[PDB]
Write a protein that binds this ligand. Structure first.
Ligand SMILES: O=c1ccn([C@@H]2O[C@H](COP(=O)(O)NP(=O)(O)OP(=O)(O)O)[C@@H](O)[C@H]2O)c(=O)[nH]1
Ligand SMILES: [Mg+2]
Ligand SMILES: [Zn+2]
Length: 471
């Protein structure tokens, strides 16, 4: 026996879950207007579910085809992924000026999905692995945000694009890219006075030393010897050269540097990114990658569910619903429990970054470029079956009342196992429970109280019904 409280009014507490649910329906139908109705329609299909699957088999397969189409749009090919790799290397040049031993790791979707569409923002983590191993990373993050922001400004980033968020719970730098080849890898040094012949040789030497013996293609000075332009071998070498620290001969002669053109620039200038100083997302993303690569329909399904969850409102973290990360866990848990993919113990992914190699996320095509039409049709059928199965699983099979969506063990996780079978009554909620793989006692559904939970259940019924029809 325990207390249950409503999340839509301050004065409703009950001693049974049934009474809580009844109260949500009876007193807050305005907050969950479609729940009863969609549940009822879905409940009609349950007794004849296999017959429904059989009759709607063509439609389900067509949804499978659409799922792969949507997934294909997010796969912009290996060359596009390598643009992100180059941006990562450019950012690394910059942050090493602040802390020589820091390295840049990409995490998030390009790791988990093995593809990048060229528009999704990129997550960068900046970590000194030695320091992390000593228990001394990150340094004070507010200062790190400010230091790196200044370095980016000095290499040519505008305050219009750079958002330092030094006073957040996790301080980050957000880069907001504006919307709109030799120029892109060219830079310009502006001097505050005329350079002597010796000064000119020293600046060129500084650039040469920064990029190595192949890095500089061309250097030229203006008439008044107070601007030097350089074309480098790559966009990455261009950032590396911009990061040099010239030591000139003339007293007080100084330089400012920026890309030669305001719009045509190295990759880092052109991509939305969040820059953080913590390693947490790396292990996360690597675990998701391992699971999602283990069935050919896993990534396409995850992609369609991310979009579905956003449009249906169940993925909306600022208002306390799920994150895209949590939706990925729901999908993967379903794949594991139904036997579509093998279980992976979260502990199999090392916490330590000492042996890390994949700073640049490995590219894997969304669909095998060399499969037959027959194999492809089998994939569409499977994808449709699996997506329908996901909505069915969470609508009728998964015990939301007593169990937890968890990848921390291969068998059932009960709420009681985690101590989530009782709430301390904006409480931490245990209505819908998803265990975070690496952060113990964190429910990804902790902000989802009873009425919010029924909005979620509404959308699961809606998705189930949608896949059986023209949509
Ligand atoms: O609760 C969380 C959320 C996110 N993450 C980490 O952040 C990464 C991105 O999590 P995300 O929810 O931002 N996924 P994303 O593809 O960027 O979609 P969007 O909703 O458009 O932003 C995940 O892959 C994890 O590595 C966590 O570690 N914990
Ligand atoms: Mg994100
Ligand atoms: Zn209430």
């Amino acid at each position: 026996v325990r207390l249950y409280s409503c999340d839509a009014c301050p004065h409703a507490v009950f001693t049974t879950h049934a009474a809580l649910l009844a109260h949500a329906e009876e007193h807050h139908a305005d907050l969950l207007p479609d729940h009863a109705r969609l549940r009822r329609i879905a409940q009609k299909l349950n007794p004849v579910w296999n017959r429904a699957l059989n009759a709607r088999r063509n439609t389900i397969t067509s949804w499978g085809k659409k799922i792969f189409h949507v997934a294909a749009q997010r796969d912009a090919g290996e060359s596009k992924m390598q643009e992100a790799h180059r941006a990562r290397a450019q950012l690394e040049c910059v942050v090493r000026r602040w802390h020589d031993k820091a390295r840049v790791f990409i995490f998030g979707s390009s790791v988990a999905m093995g593809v990048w569409d060229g528009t999704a923002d990129i997550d960068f983590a900046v970590v000194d692995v030695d320091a992390m191993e000593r228990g001394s990373w990150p340094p004070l993050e507010k200062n790190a945000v400010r230091s790196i922001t200044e370095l980016l400004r000095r290499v040519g980033f505008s305050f219009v694009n750079l958002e330092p968020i030094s006073h957040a719970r996790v301080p980050i730098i957000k880069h907001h890219a504006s919307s709109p080849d030799v120029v892109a890898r060219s830079i310009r040094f502006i001097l505050n006075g005329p350079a002597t012949r010796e000064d000119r040789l020293l600046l060129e030497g500084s650039v040469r030393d920064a990029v190595g013996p192949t890095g500089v293609q061309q250097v030229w000075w203006n008439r008044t010897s107070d601007m030097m332009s350089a074309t480098l071998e790559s966009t990455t070498a261009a950032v590396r050269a911009a990061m040099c620290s010239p030591a000139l001969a003339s007293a007080s002669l100084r330089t400012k540097v920026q890309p030669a053109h305001d719009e045509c620039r190295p990759e880092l200038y052109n991509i939305d990114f969040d820059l953080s100083f913590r390693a947490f997302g790396i292990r996360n993303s690597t675990l998701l990658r391992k699971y999602l690569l283990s069935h050919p329909c896993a990534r396409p399904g995850a992609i369609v569910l991310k979009d579905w969850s956003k449009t249906s409102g169940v993925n909306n973290s600022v208002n306390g619903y799920f994150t895209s990360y949590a939706i990925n866990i729901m999908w993967i848990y379903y794949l594991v429990q139904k036997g579509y993919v093998p279980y992976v113990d979260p502990l199999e992914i090392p916490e330590s970054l000492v042996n890390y190699t994949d700073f640049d996320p490995r590219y894997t095509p969304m669909i095998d470029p060399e499969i037959t039409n027959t194999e492809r049709e089998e994939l569409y059928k499977a994808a449709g079956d699996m997506l329908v199965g996901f909505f069915y699983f969470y609508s009728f099979e998964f015990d939301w009342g007593h169990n937890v969506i968890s990848l921390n063990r291969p068998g059932i996780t009960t709420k009681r196992m985690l101590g989530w079978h009782v709430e301390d009554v904006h409480p931490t909620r245990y209505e819908l429970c998803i265990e975070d793989p690496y952060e113990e006692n964190l429910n990804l559904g902790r902000h989802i109280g009873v009425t919010k939970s029924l909005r979620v259940r509404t959308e699961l019924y809606r998705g189930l019904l949608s896949l059986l029809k023209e949509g």
